[PDB]
Design a protein around this ligand. Structure first.
Ligand SMILES: CCCCCCCC/C=C\CCCCCCCC(=O)OC[C@H](COP(=O)(O)OCCN)OC(=O)CCCCCCC/C=C\CCCCCCCC
Ligand SMILES: CCCCCCCC/C=C\CCCCCCCC(=O)OC[C@H](COP(=O)(O)OCCN)OC(=O)CCCCCCC/C=C\CCCCCCCC
Ligand code: HEM
Ligand code: HEM
Ligand code: HEM
Ligand SMILES: COC(=O)CNC(=O)CCC/C=C\NC(=O)c1ccc(Cc2ccc(I)cc2)cc1
Ligand SMILES: CCCCCCCCO[C@@H]1O[C@H](CO)[C@@H](O)[C@H](O)[C@H]1O
Ligand SMILES: CCCCCCCCO[C@@H]1O[C@H](CO)[C@@H](O)[C@H](O)[C@H]1O
Lengths: 271, 100, 49, 59, 442, 55, 422, 54
């Protein structure tokens, strides 16, 4: 469902950007050094590089102007997300929801209400429990403590790692030992989602009926888990090499192993 | 030797769409060609394909499968569509190369 | 009948170059348009700036 | 005829119409700016720093 | 071979009489044949007071002469099996007879007798008056035509071309023996008439008859002069006749044509072949080669549509007419204007290769029988000023290629204010501007 | 006109045309839930967000 | 460089008649005439003839619905099917240098149709349409009825699939209609602008479907009844006829002449046609606009004959009655030995002009070339025409007033008469 | 199908509410304020952010 999907990706991208700015507001040590490293990422583009950054910071280095405009950004973006979510959902409604078996379902559909309105209220409470359980019994588990120290533009902390949801990226950016390479690898580490739709070779729609693909799929998941962990670790042996591999393997499973297994599969059904 | 055959048969039981009573061609993703083919299906063959799916869907919703004795067997699987499809495709392939 | 019907007189509003029902309107087109198009094209420049 | 030559080589092909507004505006700006600046610096003679400048610009 | 069967067709012969008449004909072997006088007359030559002469005449040209009244005329003709028919456009009237090559002479005599010694009985006119008036209450319900007239009526608006051939209701109610006379007198003159025929006739044998009945030589240079006509101004515009009570709606769009002479008309017809025409019954269906035809089918766009290249002495109309349901006029119009653009911007060598071969055989079928072959000569001499052989027509077509078309169509279509005429329950189509806007880019 | 006021109201029709009468595969699993959660998630961040931004 | 030629006509073993004729026109026109039609239809498979006619563009074992249309349009060709109650005619036209290719399809269409279940059911709704257009002419509505009101079978079957059967015809039904009719012995491969040495090489080396009269047609039983259709319409159409002659049966030429004797159409635009007994005969009774003429059809094992009127509803009666009295006063020595001499030219003429249009010629050559595998020179036909006596005519006119008559109408038949009142 | 201005679930909107929108052939200038108000809003918001950023 290409359109429903592509919007999805844009959405993800926005959320990613949104959290980034939100995180800087508290103006902690990370906030800062985070704000300093991430924006600096655009400085990888040649020509309009160093210059683009300037708007970002609103200066010649991170300072107030940055902070206030980030607050503006953060205040605004969410709404944009809510807006695109409308497009996302609106596109979806032209085709109906997909389904686990990957075959027509017209032959039997049911009203969202009360079948799914009820299924969801429950789903919501099943996820709400852990999330409250953390935010009520272990508030700081997922959060770095280094950020309890007011930003100091003079001292970058020794043990620096982004909040968990950015580790895989982090790991890849750290995998390639080149300003640009890292950036690019990064850029594509996510931008690749746009390709998934054109890398579909199986005659069937879901994996439910493709054990091969399935194994490869879970291999990818786990592959991701590692990359995350690797981001949690410092640049040293073995980690460096492990990171490097996992990245290669991430990109490869997506760009070559899926399409290749996908085809092979068909021939094994005699299509 | 009987390798390919040995293989195919395995994969077939592997994918396991039989567990749901679905023939190989029931699980085909419906692109434009397939859509077209399905419309060319003889009244009954279609009404039958229909049931099978509306029945498989009912299963997936209940989370259950068919008792062992009602599963499709690799050799008794009828490719009721493969021929109609190859024709749609062979037909299309023409229109396309002819527009040059 | 569809015969007792004729296009009224649009001379009050016609552009001078095509007011005489005996001269091809095709010679004086290049202009009639080049102009209105020049107004247009200019406005576009004004906007741009 | 200018208008005809105009309509033929410019306002006709939608592609060149645009190409004109561009190269066109360009000149317009460059020119307009000068005028207004001049019409202004003229209406305020001897009052702008650009006029007083030499009384302190040790040169 | 095609190329050769083309050059065997007997060169068409021509000779003039020192009075203005011109005689031509193509000899064959057929025992039967057709002959006729092709007058360069019509409503285009009429004025505000006499709109309806060429018609009122065409109506009495078959009710007798002074030599042999009503019965006698018909009787003598029927009794030899010949067929006498005629017509009268805006700028070309014609009277012609089909009969056995044996009666070649006796025929010409008759033709010469209608054109020159037309009866015009006062009892007959006041009778053909009530009839024309009827052929109107009827011709009025032929939308296709109610439209094409309106198209003229505003495309050439204000000029003479912009008139109905059947003429006004008032005129046909008041024309007088007198007025009819003049029309005949002032218009049916030898230097402007053409004796054409085809069949198993000898050229000499034909002309000979002419010399005998189409005599009456002239004295002053005045009589040997072809009155040149006042140009007709094209005017981009529209005329909308609404009646949501009609089943379908007819629309017709057009640009100013080039005029008979122009060698471009060839290119244009080659184009018009690319888009061709379509109509409900076409067994072709979704596989037809005409993009518009195809789309027209795919989306139930219209009951029928057609391309046309009406040509005249100095000008002409070029466009298309389609009939559709009140709820598809739009989509249709749109698809069309697009195909027009496509022409001007990306016509391919294949699109034209086919178009050519089509036009080719269309023109060949224009010469299917004696009557139509004749009509080709009557019209050729009177318009082109000679006879254009299929060998020629063909070569002129073999010349056309993509580039050619693209330039010509751009030349006559691209960004031109169009003439629009719509009839029926036409609400869905609604804007000259918007339409104008559809005359460029695509 | 229209009978019930849930299909003809240019507003109410929407909550009913996209959240109630909406046709859904009789068999979508739990992995289809995240859709909503993500929405409730957004709508919720925004609340805590303003409340926060107010200080 | 070209000149004159001769008309050849071979006849293969299986019975496939081949008629050639090179007239060096820049364009050829090949065709396949066949003893087919809605006369071999049984109650159970009506209209299957009709649909078969529109099913012309449908895929064959050697060409797709697509490639057939695009392949033919690519050369500026044309493909059309023409059929009577008892004869189908498939024929393409085109330029000489292309005939080669247009043939493949002409062949494939008439010899190897696949009649795919879908292409078919997807084409049936057309019948509803194709039929609706034709019927805009009341001219055709009254003819359908006549035939059915003048017959018990075969010829009584309608030319346009009846309304009830639209959409119920099958692929099976079509097929058995081809396998059982389009057999080599009922087929004729007639062609113009072609070398007989080629129009031949095709028929034999390429044609298949075996021979045999396939399925004989139900002998035409004459009925003779009336069908009156009240429809409120402004004009009343009507045709009263009686068994006429058959095809090639000397006794026809008489009617064919008695046809012209009563006036069978106009020859002068907006005319009065005095050489029309019938016409003139009616004008001397009616005051308002009307129209009447001589009806005449010749079928292999039967035929019809009479007159056809059209008039305002109020005068409908007298106009028809006058149509009769004018036929009686004609069946009783009121035919000048000279009227007969005239109708002979009109007939010699009409015929002769029908050979002008390539289409008109390919039809004369064909009909003959299929019903006998012969071709009667134009001087022989004109001979069998004047070989008519004033008696044969006065008799034709008599064979009418005695036999059982069949009638057909349509319109406000409020003041129109019944058959039993003539 | 046919044109991509009436079947695109997005483009259709800008075309279903801003181009093909049927309007009385005669609304005056007092009907213009509608848009202006809109342009006014969108415009305030721009200067607004720009400002809020300082
Ligand atoms: C990204 C950053 C890294 C974050 C790490 C993600 C957290 C890792 C935790 C792993 C998630 C636990 C999942 C275990 C569930 C096991 C299970 O049930 O699998 C089998 C089951 C079989 O279903 P059917 O074949 O349809 O059967 C038909 C009915 N009988 O499969 C499923 O449940 C469907 C799979 C959905 C789970 C996907 C979640 C994994 C998350 C990773 C993100 C991957 C995408 C790429 C992101 C790029 C940025
Ligand atoms: C140094 C300066 C360099 C400047 C660089 C900017 C370059 C931008 C140029 C874009 C190219 C323009 C070409 C458009 C082509 C479209 C077209 O067809 O014509 C315009 C087309 C009309 O069609 P036709 O006249 O029939 O043309 C037929 C051609 N044969 O559209 C129009 O009507 C254009 C004119 C409308 C102007 C609307 C703007 C008015 C608003 C004013 C407020 C002021 C501006 C403030 C902007 C704030 C932005 C945050
Ligand atoms: C704020 C962003 C997002 C929200 C709140 C959101 C919400 C939704 C909702 C409500 C659904 C329907 C129910 C469901 O199937 O879960 C949906 C469907 C979907 N979304 Fe998202 N979505 C978001 C992000 C994305 C992203 C990042 C992707 C992936 C690039 C994506 C891809 C899809 C797809 C493919 C579907 C189809 C569902 C199906 O398979 O039936 N969405 N989304
Ligand atoms: C788009 C969904 C949202 C996401 C993903 C998000 C995420 C975050 C993050 C990562 C932080 C830093 C939290 C921390 O200090 O640990 C944060 C802070 C903040 N966000 Fe949001 N936020 C969202 C929406 C908003 C909105 C809509 C507002 C209100 C316009 C808002 C207002 C703030 C404020 C005031 C802070 C600073 C105070 C604080 O750090 O607690 N946020 N947000
Ligand atoms: C709804 C349309 C808007 C209206 C009617 C409006 C009106 C105003 C008014 C009355 C003021 C005080 C102006 C003054 O100092 O003289 C103001 C200030 C301000 N507005 Fe808005 N505003 C609008 C939208 C916004 C938006 C969308 C933002 C950005 C979220 C914004 C940001 C600001 C800022 C930063 C100030 C304070 C600085 C200043 O006073 O110049 N405004 N606005
Ligand atoms: C939640 O915020 C954070 O975790 C930000 N804080 C930090 O990254 C703290 C440490 C700063 C140092 C290095 N960071 C990175 O190299 C880094 C690299 C990539 C990303 C992902 C990301 C990219 C663009 C964009 I736009 C967003 C994300 C995020 C961080
Ligand atoms: C108010 C809740 C809106 C849910 C988003 C779905 C909107 C798509 O709904 C469409 O418009 C129909
Ligand atoms: C892009 C300009 C938007 C102007 C705001 C008007 C909205 O409202 C209308 O409702 C219909 C039914 O849901 C939709 O199909 C139309 O697209 C929508 O414009």
């Amino acid at each position: 469902y290409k359109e429903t999907w592509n919007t999805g990706v844009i959405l993800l991208l926005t959320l990613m950007a949104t959290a980034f700015v939100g995180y800087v507001l508290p103006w902690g040590q990370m906030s800062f050094w985070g704000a300093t490293v991430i924006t600096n990422l655009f400085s990888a583009i040649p020509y309009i590089g160093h210059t683009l950054v300037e708007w970002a910071w609103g200066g010649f280095s991170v300072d107030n102007p940055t902070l206030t405009r980030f607050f503006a950004l953060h205040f605004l973006l969410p709404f944009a997300i809510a807006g695109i979510t409308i497009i996302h959902l609106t596109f979806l409604h032209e085709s109906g929801s997909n389904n686990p078996l990957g075959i027509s379902s017209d032959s039997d559909k049911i009203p969202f209400h009360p079948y799914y309105s009820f299924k969801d209220i429950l789903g919501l409470t099943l996820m709400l429990t852990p999330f409250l359980t953390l935010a009520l019994f272990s508030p700081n588990l997922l959060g770095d403590p280094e950020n309890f120290t007011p930003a100091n533009p003079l001292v970058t902390p020794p043990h620096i790692k982004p909040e968990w949801y950015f580790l895989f990226a982090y790991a890849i950016l750290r995998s390639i030992p080149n300003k640009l390479g890292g950036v690019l690898a990064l850029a594509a580490s996510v931008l690749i989602l746009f390709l998934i739709p054109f890398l579909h070779k199986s005659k069937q729609r879901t994996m439910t009926f493709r054990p091969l693909s399935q194994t490869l799929f879970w291999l990818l998941v786990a592959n991701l888990l590692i990359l995350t962990w690797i981001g949690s670790q410092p640049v040293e042996h073995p980690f460096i090499i492990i990171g490097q591999m996992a990245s290669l393997s991430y990109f490869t499973i997506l760009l070559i192993l899926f399409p290749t297994i996908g085809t092979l599969e068909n021939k094994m059904l005699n299509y | 030797g009987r390798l390919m055959d040995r293989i195919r048969k395995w994969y077939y039981n592997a994918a396991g769409f039989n567990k749901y009573g679905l023939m190989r061609d029931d699980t085909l993703y419906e692109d434009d060609d397939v859509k077209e083919a399905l419309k060319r299906l003889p009244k009954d063959l279609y009404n039958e394909r229909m049931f099978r799916i509306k029945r498989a869907l009912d299963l997936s919703l209940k989370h259950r499968i068919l008792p062992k004795e009602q599963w499709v067997k690799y050799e008794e699987d009828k490719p009721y569509l493969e021929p109609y499809l190859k024709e749609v495709i062979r037909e299309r392939l023409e229109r396309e190369a002819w527009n040059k | 009948v569809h015969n007792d019907v004729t296009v009224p007189d649009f001379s009050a509003y016609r552009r001078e170059d095509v007011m005489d029902a005996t001269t091809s309107s095709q010679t004086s087109s290049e202009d009639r348009k080049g102009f209105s198009y020049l107004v247009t094209a200019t406005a576009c420049v004004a906007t741009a700036y | 005829a200018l208008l005809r030559q105009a309509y033929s080589a410019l306002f006709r092909r939608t592609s060149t119409f645009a190409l004109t507004v561009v190269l066109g505006a360009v000149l317009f700006e460059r020119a307009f700016d000068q005028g207004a600046d001049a019409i202004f610096e003229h209406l305020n003679e001897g009052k702008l720093w650009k006029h007083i400048k030499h009384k302190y610009e040790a040169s | 071979t095609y190329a050769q069967t083309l050059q065997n067709i007997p060169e068409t012969n021509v000779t003039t009489l020192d009075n203005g008449l011109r005689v031509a004909s193509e000899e064959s072997s057929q025992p039967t044949c057709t002959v006729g006088v092709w007058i360069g007359a019509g409503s285009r030559y009429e004025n505000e007071k006499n709109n309806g002469a060429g018609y009122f005449v065409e109506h009495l040209a078959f009710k007798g002469t002074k030599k042999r009244p009503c019965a006698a005329f018909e009787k003598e003709v029927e009794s030899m099996g010949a067929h006498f028919n005629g017509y009268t456009s805006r700028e070309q009237t014609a009277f012609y007879i089909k009969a056995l090559s044996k009666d070649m002479p006796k025929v010409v005599e008759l033709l010469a007798d209608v054109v020159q010694n037309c009866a015009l009985e006062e009892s007959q006119i006041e009778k053909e008056r009530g009839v024309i008036l009827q052929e109107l209450k009827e011709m009025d319900n032929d939308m296709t035509n109610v439209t094409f007239d309106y198209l003229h009526a505003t495309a050439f608006q204000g000029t003479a071309l912009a008139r109905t051939v059947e003429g006004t209701t008032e005129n046909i109610k008041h024309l007088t023996r007198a007025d009819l006379a003049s029309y005949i007198d002032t218009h049916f003159k030898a230097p402007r008439m053409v004796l054409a025929a085809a069949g198993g006739i000898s050229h000499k044998e034909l002309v000979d008859a002419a010399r005998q009945h189409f005599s009456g030589v002239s004295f002053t240079y005045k009589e040997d002069a072809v009155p040149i006509l006042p140009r007709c101004r094209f005017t981009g515009s529209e005329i909308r006749a609404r009646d949501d009570a009609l089943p379908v709606a007819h629309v017709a769009l057009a640009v100013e044509g080039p005029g008979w002479a122009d060698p471009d008309n060839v290119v244009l017809h080659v184009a018009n072949a690319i888009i061709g025409r379509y109509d409900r019954t076409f067994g072709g269906g979704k596989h037809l080669s005409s993009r518009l035809a195809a789309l027209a089918v795919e989306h139930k766009l219209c009951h029928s549509f057609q391309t046309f290249n009406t040509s005249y002495s100095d000008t002409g109309l070029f466009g298309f007419h389609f009939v559709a349901d009140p709820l598809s006029i739009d989509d249709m119009m749109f698809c069309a204007q697009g195909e027009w653009m496509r022409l001007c911007t990306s016509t391919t060598e294949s699109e034209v290769k086919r178009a050519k071969n089509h036009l080719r055989s269309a023109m060949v079928a224009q010469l299917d029988g004696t009557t139509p072959v004749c009509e080709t000569i009557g019209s050729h001499l009177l318009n082109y000023g000679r006879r254009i052989s299929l060998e020629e027509w063909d070569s002129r077509i073999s010349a056309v290629d993509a580039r050619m078309v693209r330039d010509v169509c751009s030349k006559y279509i691209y960004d031109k204010c169009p003439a629009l005429a719509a009839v029926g329950p036409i609400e869905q189509l609604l804007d000259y501007n918007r339409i104008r806007s559809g005359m460029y880019w695509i | 006109m229209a009978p019930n006021i849930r299909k003809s109201h240019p507003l109410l029709k929407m909550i009913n045309n996209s959240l109630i009468d909406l046709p859904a595969p009789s068999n979508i699993s739990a992995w289809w839930n995240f859709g909503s959660l993500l929405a409730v998630c957004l709508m919720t961040q925004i609340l805590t967000g303003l409340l926060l931004a107010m200080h | 460089c070209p000149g004159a030629e001769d008309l050849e006509i071979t006849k293969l073993p299986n019975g496939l008649i081949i008629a050639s004729l090179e007239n060096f026109s820049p364009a050829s026109r090949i065709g396949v005439f066949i003893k087919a039609g809605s006369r071999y239809e049984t109650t159970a498979n009506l209209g299957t003839a009709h649909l078969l006619r529109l099913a012309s563009p449908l895929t064959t074992k050697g060409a797709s619905s697509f490639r057939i249309t695009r392949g033919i349009e690519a050369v500026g060709g044309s493909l059309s099917v023409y059929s009577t109650r008892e004869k189908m005619t498939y024929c393409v036209e085109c330029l000489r240098d292309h005939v080669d290719t247009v043939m493949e399809y002409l062949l494939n269409v008439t010899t190897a149709p696949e009649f795919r279940p879908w292409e078919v059911t997807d084409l049936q709704p057309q019948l509803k349409v194709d039929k609706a257009v034709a019927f805009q002419s009341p001219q055709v509505g009254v003819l359908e009825n006549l035939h059915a009101a003048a017959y018990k079978t075969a010829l009584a079957n309608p030319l346009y699939c009846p309304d009830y059967r639209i959409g119920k015809i099958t692929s099976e039904q079509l097929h058995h209609f081809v396998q059982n009719n389009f057999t080599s012995a009922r087929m004729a491969l007639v062609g113009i602008g072609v070398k007989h040495s080629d129009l031949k090489q095709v028929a034999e080396q390429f044609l298949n479907i075996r021979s045999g009269a396939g399925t004989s047609s139900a002998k035409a039983t004459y009925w003779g009844g009336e069908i009156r259709e009240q429809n409120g319409h402004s004009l009343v159409h009507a045709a009263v006829v009686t068994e006429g002659a058959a095809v090639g049966s000397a006794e026809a030429n008489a009617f064919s002449v008695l046809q012209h004797v009563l006036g069978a159409g106009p020859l002068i635009k907006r005319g009065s046609s005095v050489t029309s007994k019938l016409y003139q005969g009616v004008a001397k009774a009616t005051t308002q606009p009307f129209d009447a003429s001589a009806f005449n059809v010749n079928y292999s094992d039967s035929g019809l004959f009479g007159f056809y009127t059209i008039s305002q509803a109020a005068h409908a009666g007298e106009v028809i009655r006058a149509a009769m009295n004018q036929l009686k006063a004609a069946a009783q020595g009121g035919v000048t030995e000279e009227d007969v001499t005239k109708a002979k030219n009109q007939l010699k003429a009409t015929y002769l002009m029908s050979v002008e249009t390539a289409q008109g010629l390919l039809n004369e050559i064909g009909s003959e070339a299929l019903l006998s595998g012969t071709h009667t020179a134009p001087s022989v036909v004109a001979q069998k025409i004047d070989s008519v006596t004033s008696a044969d005519v006065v008799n034709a006119a008599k064979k009418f007033v005695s036999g059982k008559k069949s009638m057909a109408a349509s319109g406000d038949l409020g003041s129109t008469p019944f058959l039993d009142e003539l």
